[PDB]
């Protein structure tokens, strides 16, 4: 469960948040495969509540009506088509599996659902699965409200409703089997693995019992005996009875400390400095690298209400965001996920974005296609961070240096730092308020290297900055503190 099952030499996945299946299929072929992306985390493919107040929020997809693969992203035919086309170009699909719960207990009964399935939250009736009152934790939860009130009680965090979401009884073999049925449907279609949504709210043993029922991966694309990649979403910043490590038997865990701390460092908040990053990784008390799924932001905390708070860097913060993402992609710790977002009318009041609910770009609820601009960015308010040159080229950096050790660290004691990956890559950051001009040991073979942050290597040329590595491995780096992108990256495949 710990291996991503990506093609050899592909080291990242991208979250194409709220994208339609037909757009993801195209994206695999026209971009992700040639640019060396390992795979795609897709939004939940299963039927969800259609929530009209507010109007079609992104979070409606985290309230299941059934396991039909029928959503605003597409139907089962389109989903199957996407997984096939993506796998055929060597780009994997990971499903966001929402298995802890069905919808909100207060949602009105009816057919307001993305496939038109009937459901009745009040009577605990989801006939399209089918689930009934026997399949939920109503009796088991011991809190007064029936909802999670106290994170110091590990039992209620598992057995009670998260913000009132009907909590499935995952101890029951019937419920475990219905979930496995859904997941095996997806595996046989060809998905490579799963994000297990709200894993903190499930018992590690119930998750295991579900995973125990799963098929090996589709043998047309994956070697026999291949198991689905599992990454469990657990937000653990410490100090609670439930720890990320409790889930290690099932797969990897989301390390939410990673982006919280990195955001604080790059913002230079709370006295933190980039020079402190020298021991980044387990030295900062994160989970073991081989159990970590890392990221700068995710779909929830890029809206500022997550863990931790306002320190999270997002596309809105583009200059510092590119630096943080670049540091993450260069550093060997963890398996990396790149966010890809849509724009929404962010409106702050009282420290809160009142529009943080807004769903994907849409015409009266129909999600807009991803359009590609001549410069290869996206239109229709899709941000497409994964197509930003500075991010995409660092995705490739990480492929190029795969396996190479963290080495040749430099820091100035404040915010100017640099490091290499073996003899395959080197990266330099200036986050201080003065210029960085210094000669550093890059660990690289002598030659002329294209800086892949400012430009690209094309046809024996660089379109950006050129770095000159002498025969002793040393190169001069000049970075103004006022630079558009105050970091430089070079690697074996950017050499002329
Ligand atoms: Ca639960
Ligand atoms: Cl996540």
Coordinates of C-alpha atoms and ligand atoms in Angstrom, one line a residue:
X1 CA 0.0 0.0 0.0
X2 CA 3.0 2.3 0.3
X3 CA 4.2 2.4 -3.3
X4 CA 2.5 4.9 -5.6
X5 CA 2.6 2.5 -8.6
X6 CA 3.7 5.3 -10.9
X7 CA 5.8 4.6 -14.0
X8 CA 9.5 4.5 -13.2
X9 CA 10.9 8.0 -13.2
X10 CA 7.7 9.7 -12.3
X11 CA 7.7 11.1 -8.8
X12 CA 4.7 13.4 -8.2
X13 CA 0.9 13.4 -8.5
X14 CA -1.3 16.4 -9.2
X15 CA -4.7 17.2 -7.7
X16 CA -6.9 18.3 -10.6
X17 CA -9.5 19.6 -8.2
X18 CA -13.1 19.5 -9.5
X19 CA -11.9 18.8 -13.1
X20 CA -14.2 16.9 -15.5
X21 CA -13.2 13.4 -16.6
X22 CA -13.0 14.3 -20.2
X23 CA -10.6 17.2 -19.4
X24 CA -8.4 15.0 -17.3
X25 CA -8.2 12.4 -20.0
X26 CA -7.1 15.1 -22.5
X27 CA -4.7 16.5 -19.9
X28 CA -3.0 13.1 -19.4
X29 CA -2.3 12.9 -23.1
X30 CA -1.4 16.4 -24.0
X31 CA 0.5 17.5 -20.9
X32 CA 1.0 15.2 -17.9
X33 CA 2.6 12.3 -19.9
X34 CA 5.1 14.4 -21.9
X35 CA 5.9 16.5 -18.8
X36 CA 6.6 13.5 -16.6
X37 CA 3.8 13.7 -14.1
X38 CA 3.1 10.5 -12.2
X39 CA -0.6 10.7 -11.7
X40 CA -3.8 12.5 -10.8
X41 CA -5.8 12.7 -7.7
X42 CA -9.4 13.0 -8.9
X43 CA -12.4 14.5 -7.0
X44 CA -14.8 11.9 -5.6
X45 CA -16.2 10.0 -8.5
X46 CA -19.3 8.7 -6.7
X47 CA -22.7 10.3 -6.6
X48 CA -23.1 13.1 -4.0
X49 CA -25.8 15.4 -2.7
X50 CA -26.6 18.3 -5.0
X51 CA -26.6 21.2 -2.6
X52 CA -28.3 24.3 -3.8
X53 CA -27.9 26.5 -0.8
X54 CA -25.2 27.8 -1.2
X55 CA -25.1 27.0 -4.9
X56 CA -23.2 23.8 -5.7
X57 CA -20.3 24.2 -3.2
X58 CA -17.1 22.3 -3.7
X59 CA -17.8 20.4 -0.4
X60 CA -21.1 18.9 -1.7
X61 CA -18.8 16.2 -3.2
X62 CA -17.8 15.0 0.3
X63 CA -21.5 14.1 1.0
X64 CA -22.2 10.7 -0.7
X65 CA -25.7 9.6 -1.9
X66 CA -24.5 6.3 -3.5
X67 CA -21.5 4.6 -5.2
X68 CA -22.7 5.2 -8.7
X69 CA -20.0 6.9 -10.7
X70 CA -22.1 9.7 -11.6
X71 CA -21.0 13.3 -10.7
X72 CA -20.6 16.8 -12.1
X73 CA -17.2 15.5 -13.4
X74 CA -18.9 12.9 -15.6
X75 CA -20.6 9.6 -15.8
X76 CA -19.2 6.1 -15.5
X77 CA -18.4 5.9 -19.3
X78 CA -16.4 9.1 -19.1
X79 CA -14.7 8.0 -15.9
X80 CA -13.7 4.6 -17.4
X81 CA -12.5 6.4 -20.6
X82 CA -10.3 8.8 -18.5
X83 CA -8.7 6.0 -16.5
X84 CA -8.0 4.0 -19.7
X85 CA -6.5 6.9 -21.6
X86 CA -4.4 8.1 -18.7
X87 CA -3.0 4.6 -18.0
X88 CA -2.2 4.1 -21.7
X89 CA 0.1 7.1 -21.5
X90 CA 1.6 6.1 -18.2
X91 CA -0.2 8.5 -15.9
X92 CA -2.1 7.0 -12.9
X93 CA -5.4 7.8 -11.4
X94 CA -6.0 8.0 -7.6
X95 CA -9.5 8.3 -6.3
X96 CA -10.7 10.4 -3.4
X97 CA -12.6 7.7 -1.5
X98 CA -15.3 9.2 0.8
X99 CA -16.0 6.2 2.9
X100 CA -16.4 7.4 6.5
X101 CA -19.9 8.9 6.0
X102 CA -22.9 9.6 3.8
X103 CA -24.4 13.1 3.7
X104 CA -25.4 15.6 6.4
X105 CA -28.1 14.3 8.8
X106 CA -30.1 17.5 8.2
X107 CA -30.2 17.3 4.4
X108 CA -33.7 17.2 3.0
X109 CA -34.9 13.9 1.6
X110 CA -35.5 13.6 -2.1
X111 CA -33.7 13.2 -5.4
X112 CA -31.4 16.2 -5.2
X113 CA -28.3 14.2 -6.1
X114 CA -25.9 14.2 -8.9
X115 CA -27.3 11.0 -10.5
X116 CA -30.9 11.5 -9.3
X117 CA -30.8 8.7 -6.7
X118 CA -33.4 8.9 -4.0
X119 CA -32.1 9.3 -0.4
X120 CA -33.6 10.1 3.0
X121 CA -31.0 11.3 5.7
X122 CA -33.6 11.6 8.5
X123 CA -34.7 8.0 8.0
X124 CA -31.0 6.9 7.3
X125 CA -32.2 5.5 4.0
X126 CA -29.9 5.3 0.9
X127 CA -31.6 2.8 -1.3
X128 CA -29.1 3.2 -4.2
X129 CA -26.3 1.5 -2.1
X130 CA -28.5 0.2 -0.2
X131 CA -27.9 1.5 3.3
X132 CA -30.4 1.8 6.1
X133 CA -30.5 2.8 9.8
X134 CA -28.8 -0.4 10.8
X135 CA -25.7 0.8 8.8
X136 CA -24.9 4.0 10.8
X137 CA -23.4 4.8 14.2
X138 CA -26.5 6.4 15.8
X139 CA -26.5 3.9 18.6
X140 CA -22.8 3.6 19.1
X141 CA -22.0 7.4 19.5
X142 CA -22.1 8.4 23.1
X143 CA -22.0 12.2 22.8
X144 CA -25.0 14.4 23.7
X145 CA -25.3 16.0 20.2
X146 CA -24.4 12.8 18.3
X147 CA -21.6 14.8 16.7
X148 CA -17.9 14.9 17.5
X149 CA -17.4 17.4 20.4
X150 CA -14.1 16.4 21.9
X151 CA -10.9 15.4 20.1
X152 CA -9.4 14.2 23.5
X153 CA -11.8 11.3 23.2
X154 CA -10.5 9.0 20.5
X155 CA -13.6 6.9 20.5
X156 CA -16.1 9.7 19.7
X157 CA -13.9 11.1 17.0
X158 CA -14.4 7.7 15.3
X159 CA -18.0 6.8 16.3
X160 CA -19.8 10.2 16.1
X161 CA -20.8 12.5 13.3
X162 CA -18.2 14.8 11.8
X163 CA -20.0 18.1 11.6
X164 CA -23.3 16.1 11.5
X165 CA -22.4 13.8 8.6
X166 CA -24.1 10.5 8.9
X167 CA -21.4 8.2 10.2
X168 CA -21.2 4.7 8.6
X169 CA -20.8 1.7 10.9
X170 CA -17.5 0.5 9.5
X171 CA -17.3 -2.4 11.9
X172 CA -20.1 -4.2 10.0
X173 CA -19.0 -6.6 7.3
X174 CA -22.0 -5.5 5.2
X175 CA -20.9 -1.9 5.2
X176 CA -17.2 -2.9 4.7
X177 CA -18.3 -5.1 1.8
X178 CA -20.4 -2.3 0.1
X179 CA -17.4 0.0 0.3
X180 CA -15.1 -2.7 -1.0
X181 CA -17.5 -3.3 -3.9
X182 CA -17.2 0.4 -4.8
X183 CA -13.4 0.4 -4.5
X184 CA -13.0 -2.9 -6.5
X185 CA -15.1 -1.4 -9.2
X186 CA -12.6 1.4 -9.4
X187 CA -9.5 -0.8 -9.2
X188 CA -10.8 -3.0 -12.0
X189 CA -11.4 0.1 -14.1
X190 CA -7.7 0.7 -13.5
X191 CA -7.2 3.2 -10.7
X192 CA -3.8 2.9 -9.0
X193 CA -4.8 3.9 -5.5
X194 CA -6.8 6.0 -3.1
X195 CA -6.9 9.0 -0.9
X196 CA -8.9 7.8 2.1
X197 CA -10.9 10.9 3.1
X198 CA -11.4 11.6 6.8
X199 CA -9.2 8.7 7.9
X200 CA -8.9 10.2 11.4
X201 CA -12.6 9.6 11.8
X202 CA -12.2 5.9 11.0
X203 CA -10.7 3.1 13.2
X204 CA -7.4 1.9 11.7
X205 CA -8.8 -1.6 12.1
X206 CA -12.0 -0.9 10.1
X207 CA -9.8 0.6 7.3
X208 CA -7.7 -2.5 7.4
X209 CA -10.8 -4.8 7.1
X210 CA -11.9 -2.8 4.1
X211 CA -8.5 -2.9 2.4
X212 CA -8.4 -6.7 3.1
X213 CA -11.3 -7.1 0.6
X214 CA -9.6 -5.3 -2.3
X215 CA -8.4 -6.7 -5.6
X216 CA -4.9 -6.4 -6.9
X217 CA -4.4 -3.7 -9.5
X218 CA -5.5 -4.3 -13.1
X219 CA -3.1 -6.7 -14.6
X220 CA -3.1 -5.1 -18.1
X221 CA -1.3 -2.0 -16.6
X222 CA 0.3 -3.2 -13.4
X223 CA 2.6 -6.1 -12.5
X224 CA 0.8 -9.0 -10.9
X225 CA 0.4 -8.7 -7.1
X226 CA 0.4 -4.9 -7.3
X227 CA -1.6 -3.3 -4.4
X228 CA -3.5 0.0 -4.5
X229 CA -1.5 3.0 -3.2
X230 CA -3.1 4.1 0.0
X231 CA -2.8 7.6 1.5
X232 CA -4.9 8.4 4.5
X233 CA -6.1 11.9 5.2
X234 CA -5.2 12.5 8.9
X235 CA -4.6 16.1 10.0
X236 CA -2.4 15.6 13.0
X237 CA -0.4 18.6 14.3
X238 CA 0.3 16.8 17.6
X239 CA -0.9 16.7 21.1
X240 CA -3.9 14.3 20.7
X241 CA -4.6 10.7 21.5
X242 CA -4.9 9.9 17.8
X243 CA -1.6 10.1 15.9
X244 CA -0.7 9.7 12.2
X245 CA 1.4 6.7 13.1
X246 CA -1.7 4.8 14.1
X247 CA -2.5 4.5 10.4
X248 CA 0.9 3.3 9.1
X249 CA -0.2 -0.3 8.9
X250 CA -2.7 0.7 6.1
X251 CA -0.6 2.9 3.9
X252 CA 0.9 6.4 3.8
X253 CA -0.6 9.4 5.7
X254 CA -1.0 13.0 4.7
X255 CA 1.6 15.1 6.5
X256 CA -0.3 18.3 7.2
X257 CA 2.6 19.6 9.4
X258 CA 4.6 19.9 6.2
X259 CA 2.8 22.8 4.5
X260 CA 1.9 24.5 7.8
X261 CA 5.5 24.7 8.8
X262 CA 6.8 25.5 5.3
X263 CA 4.3 28.3 4.8
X264 CA 5.4 29.8 8.1
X265 CA 9.0 29.6 7.2
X266 CA 8.7 31.1 3.7
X267 CA 6.5 33.9 5.0
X268 CA 9.2 34.5 7.7
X269 CA 6.5 34.4 10.4
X270 CA 7.0 33.6 14.0
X271 CA 10.8 34.1 13.8
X272 CA 11.2 31.2 11.4
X273 CA 13.9 31.3 8.7
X274 CA 14.8 29.2 5.6
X275 CA 18.2 28.4 7.1
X276 CA 16.4 26.3 9.7
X277 CA 15.3 24.0 6.8
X278 CA 18.6 22.2 6.8
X279 CA 17.2 19.3 8.9
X280 CA 13.8 19.5 7.1
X281 CA 11.8 16.2 7.2
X282 CA 11.8 13.8 10.2
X283 CA 14.2 16.2 12.0
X284 CA 11.1 18.6 12.2
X285 CA 9.2 15.7 13.8
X286 CA 7.2 14.8 10.7
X287 CA 6.3 11.2 9.9
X288 CA 8.9 8.9 8.4
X289 CA 9.5 9.9 4.8
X290 CA 8.4 6.6 3.4
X291 CA 5.0 7.1 5.0
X292 CA 4.5 10.8 4.0
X293 CA 2.3 12.3 1.3
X294 CA 3.4 15.9 1.2
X295 CA 2.1 19.1 -0.3
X296 CA 2.2 22.9 0.2
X297 CA -1.6 23.3 0.2
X298 CA -4.6 21.1 -0.4
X299 CA -8.1 21.8 -1.6
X300 CA -9.4 22.6 1.9
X301 CA -6.6 24.5 3.6
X302 CA -6.0 26.7 0.5
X303 CA -9.2 28.5 1.6
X304 CA -7.6 29.5 4.9
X305 CA -9.8 27.7 7.3
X306 CA -7.7 24.5 7.6
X307 CA -4.6 23.5 9.4
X308 CA -2.7 25.6 9.9
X309 CA -4.7 28.7 9.1
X310 CA -3.4 31.7 7.3
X311 CA 0.2 30.4 7.1
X312 CA -0.7 28.1 4.2
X313 CA 0.7 29.3 0.9
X314 CA -1.5 29.2 -2.3
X315 CA -1.6 30.4 -5.9
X316 CA -3.0 33.7 -4.5
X317 CA 0.5 34.1 -3.0
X318 CA 2.1 33.1 -6.3
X319 CA 5.7 34.4 -5.8
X320 CA 6.2 32.7 -2.4
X321 CA 4.1 29.8 -3.4
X322 CA 6.4 28.9 -6.3
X323 CA 9.3 29.0 -3.9
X324 CA 7.7 26.7 -1.4
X325 CA 6.6 24.3 -4.0
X326 CA 10.1 24.4 -5.5
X327 CA 11.7 23.6 -2.2
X328 CA 9.3 20.7 -1.6
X329 CA 9.9 19.3 -5.1
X330 CA 13.7 19.5 -4.7
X331 CA 13.8 18.1 -1.2
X332 CA 13.9 14.2 -0.9
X333 CA 11.4 14.0 2.0
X334 CA 8.0 12.4 1.1
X335 CA 6.0 11.6 -1.9
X336 CA 4.9 14.9 -3.5
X337 CA 1.4 16.1 -4.5
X338 CA 1.0 19.3 -6.5
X339 CA -2.2 21.3 -6.2
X340 CA -4.2 22.5 -9.2
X341 CA -6.9 25.0 -8.4
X342 CA -9.7 27.2 -9.7
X343 CA -10.1 30.9 -9.0
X344 CA -13.1 32.0 -7.0
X345 CA -14.2 35.5 -5.8
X346 CA -12.3 35.4 -2.5
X347 CA -14.0 38.0 -0.1
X348 CA -12.6 38.5 3.4
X349 CA -14.7 39.7 6.3
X350 CA -13.8 39.3 9.9
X351 CA -10.8 37.1 9.0
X352 CA -13.1 34.8 7.0
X353 CA -13.6 34.2 3.3
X354 CA -17.4 34.2 2.9
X355 CA -17.0 32.8 -0.6
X356 CA -14.8 29.9 0.5
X357 CA -17.7 27.5 -0.4
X358 CA -17.8 28.5 -4.1
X359 CA -17.6 25.4 -6.4
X360 CA -15.7 25.1 -9.7
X361 CA -16.2 27.5 -12.6
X362 CA -19.7 26.8 -13.9
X363 CA -22.6 27.8 -16.0
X364 CA -25.7 27.4 -13.9
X365 CA -24.1 24.4 -12.2
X366 CA -22.5 22.8 -15.2
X367 CA -18.7 22.7 -14.7
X368 CA -16.8 24.7 -17.4
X369 CA -14.3 22.9 -19.6
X370 CA -10.6 23.6 -19.1
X371 CA -9.4 25.7 -22.0
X372 CA -5.8 26.0 -22.9
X373 CA -4.3 29.5 -23.8
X374 CA -1.7 29.9 -26.5
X375 CA 1.0 30.3 -23.7
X376 CA -0.2 26.9 -22.3
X377 CA -1.8 28.4 -19.2
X378 CA -5.5 27.7 -18.6
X379 CA -8.6 29.8 -19.2
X380 CA -12.1 29.7 -17.8
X381 CA -10.8 30.5 -14.3
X382 CA -8.8 27.3 -13.9
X383 CA -5.5 28.3 -12.3
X384 CA -3.5 25.3 -13.5
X385 CA -0.6 25.7 -11.2
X386 CA 0.8 22.5 -12.5
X387 CA 1.4 24.2 -15.9
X388 CA 3.3 27.2 -14.4
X389 CA 6.8 26.8 -15.8
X390 CA 8.4 27.2 -12.4
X391 CA 6.3 24.4 -10.9
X392 CA 6.2 22.0 -13.9
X393 CA 10.0 22.2 -14.3
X394 CA 10.4 21.4 -10.6
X395 CA 8.2 18.4 -11.1
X396 CA 10.7 17.3 -13.8
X397 CA 13.7 18.3 -11.5
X398 CA 12.3 15.8 -8.9
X399 CA 12.2 13.0 -11.6
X400 CA 15.7 13.8 -12.7
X401 CA 17.2 13.7 -9.3
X402 CA 15.2 10.7 -8.0
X403 CA 17.2 8.6 -5.5
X404 CA 20.0 11.1 -5.1
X405 CA 21.0 12.2 -1.6
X406 CA 20.4 15.6 0.0
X407 CA 23.8 17.2 -0.1
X408 CA 25.9 20.4 -0.4
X409 CA 23.7 22.4 1.9
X410 CA 24.5 26.1 2.3
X411 CA 22.9 28.8 4.4
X412 CA 23.8 32.3 5.3
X413 CA 22.2 32.0 8.8
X414 CA 19.1 33.8 7.6
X415 CA 17.0 33.2 4.5
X416 CA 19.6 32.4 1.7
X417 CA 20.0 28.7 1.3
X418 CA 21.0 26.1 -1.3
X419 CA 21.4 22.4 -1.7
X420 CA 22.1 19.6 -4.2
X421 CA 20.7 16.2 -5.0
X422 CA 23.7 14.0 -5.5
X423 CA 25.4 14.9 -8.8
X424 CA 22.1 15.4 -10.6
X425 CA 20.6 18.7 -9.4
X426 CA 21.2 21.9 -7.4
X427 CA 18.8 24.6 -6.2
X428 CA 19.4 28.1 -4.7
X429 CA 16.9 30.3 -2.8
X430 CA 17.1 34.0 -1.7
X431 CA 14.3 34.9 0.7
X432 CA 16.2 37.7 2.4
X433 CA 15.8 41.4 1.9
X434 CA 19.2 41.8 0.3
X435 CA 20.8 40.3 -2.8
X436 CA 22.4 36.9 -3.0
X437 CA 25.7 36.8 -5.0
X438 CA 27.9 33.9 -4.1
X439 CA 29.9 31.0 -5.6
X440 CA 28.6 27.7 -4.4
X441 CA 29.6 24.0 -4.7
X442 CA 26.8 22.5 -6.9
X443 CA 28.1 18.9 -6.9
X444 CA 27.4 18.9 -10.7
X445 CA 29.6 18.0 -13.7
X446 CA 31.2 21.0 -15.4
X447 CA 29.0 22.7 -18.1
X448 CA 26.4 25.3 -19.0
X449 CA 23.1 24.7 -17.3
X450 CA 19.7 26.2 -18.1
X451 CA 18.0 27.6 -15.0
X452 CA 14.6 25.9 -15.3
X453 CA 12.9 28.4 -13.1
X454 CA 13.4 31.4 -15.3
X455 CA 13.3 29.4 -18.6
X456 CA 13.6 26.1 -20.4
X457 CA 16.2 24.1 -22.3
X458 CA 15.1 23.9 -26.0
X459 CA 17.2 22.8 -29.0
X460 CA 20.7 23.4 -27.6
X461 CA 19.5 26.7 -26.1
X462 CA 18.3 28.2 -22.8
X463 CA 15.3 30.6 -22.9
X464 CA 16.2 31.9 -19.4
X465 CA 19.2 32.3 -17.2
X466 CA 22.4 30.3 -17.9
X467 CA 24.5 28.9 -15.0
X468 CA 28.2 28.0 -15.6
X469 CA 29.6 25.2 -13.5
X470 CA 33.4 24.9 -13.5
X471 CA 35.3 21.7 -13.4
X472 CA 35.4 21.7 -9.6
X473 CA 31.6 21.9 -9.5
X474 CA 31.4 25.5 -8.4
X475 CA 29.0 28.0 -10.0
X476 CA 28.3 31.7 -9.3
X477 CA 24.7 32.5 -8.5
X478 CA 23.2 36.0 -8.6
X479 CA 19.7 36.6 -7.2
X480 CA 18.2 39.9 -6.4
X481 CA 15.8 40.1 -3.4
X482 CA 13.5 41.9 -5.8
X483 CA 13.6 39.1 -8.4
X484 CA 10.3 37.9 -9.9
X485 CA 11.3 34.4 -8.9
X486 CA 14.0 34.5 -6.3
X487 CA 15.3 31.0 -6.8
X488 CA 17.3 29.1 -9.4
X489 CA 17.4 25.4 -10.2
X490 CA 19.6 23.4 -12.5
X491 CA 19.9 19.7 -13.2
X492 CA 21.4 17.0 -15.4
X493 CA 18.8 17.3 -18.0
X494 CA 19.0 21.1 -18.2
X495 CA 22.7 20.9 -19.2
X496 CA 23.5 22.1 -22.7
Ligands
LIG1 CA1 -16.5 7.5 11.8
LIG2 CL1 -5.5 15.8 1.5

